[PDB]
Amino acid sequence: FEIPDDVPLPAGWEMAKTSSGQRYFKNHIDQTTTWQDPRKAMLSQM
C-alpha cells in the first residue's frame, strides 16, 4: 500500500470500495474506475 494521505484526490479522480474494500479510484474526467491511484500510482516510477 504505497498510497499514503499525502494527497486526497486529483481532478475527476474519486475512489470507492467494492464488495469488500478494493479501494478503486473513480475517474470523472475520463469516466472510469481504476485500481491504481491517480495521485501516486500513475505514469511515473522513478
Binding site: 478503486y24 472510469t32 474506475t33
Partner: peptide, 10 residues
C-alpha cells in the same frame, strides 16, 4: 486479479 467496477455518478 479482476476488472474494475462499473463506475457510477449519482
Amino acid at each position: 486479479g479482476t476488472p474494475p467496477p462499473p463506475y457510477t455518478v449519482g
